[model samples]
Target: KISLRKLSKSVPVKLELTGDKASNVSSISYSFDRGHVTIVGSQEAMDKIDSITVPVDISQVTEDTSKTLELKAEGVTVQPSTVKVNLKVTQKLEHHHHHH
Candidate 1:
């Protein structure tokens, strides 16, 4: 019977953030802290897990406050592994223009 789909619970995922490329964070617009992620999969693969990918290292982020982050999705079962993030750097004119 599809092996009962393995079976697991706790679903409330949605905390997207990942830093790379010399940690520019693409300028700024990042968000975190209490975003969401309480894993334990199985509602048929947890309804396809909307979001979950937190990898941070703001490359000495100028300043904003203490940082808090850590999350993932593998064997599921992540009740409160760690959830905290809020990087609203502010002010970004965004000069990516070429054709409206």
Candidate 2:
């Protein structure tokens, strides 16, 4: 089994795997309903570490809405290893806006 963090507009989201045993995992894929998105690094990152970051971009998404995101990993010997993602979209604030 693996542990996943709640999705956010941040890079390097960590994925924690159970057990010290090494496994061969081929690819990581993700999708967002209402935003421009990009993933950093290759799916090959899975081989070297127990955890990996899935970079996300939600800048194009509008505010006050809920977006369903799906993230899955391929080449796992086990079934249902994919990470379930659910995130709420919030209003984008321009850089010029100051909050104190």
Report the lDDT tens digits of candidate 1 across residue range 25-90. Answer: 346555554566556765655677666655566555645555655565665667676756666554
| Clash count per candidate | 2, 0
- Among these predictions, the greatest lDDT belongs to 1
In candidate 1, what residue range of length 10 has the lowest lDDT sum?
A: 16-25
Candidate 1, superposed: residue stretches over 4 Å from native: 2-38, 52-63, 66-78, 86-100
Cα distance off (Å), candidate 1, residue 64: 0.8
Model 1 CA lDDT for position 53: 53
Give the range where candidate 2 is weakest over 10 consecutive residues by summed lDDT. 20-29
Against the true structure, what is each candidate's TM-score?
0.29, 0.29
Whole-model Cα lDDT of every candidate shown, in order: 0.56, 0.35
Give candidate 1's whole-model lDDT. Answer: 0.56
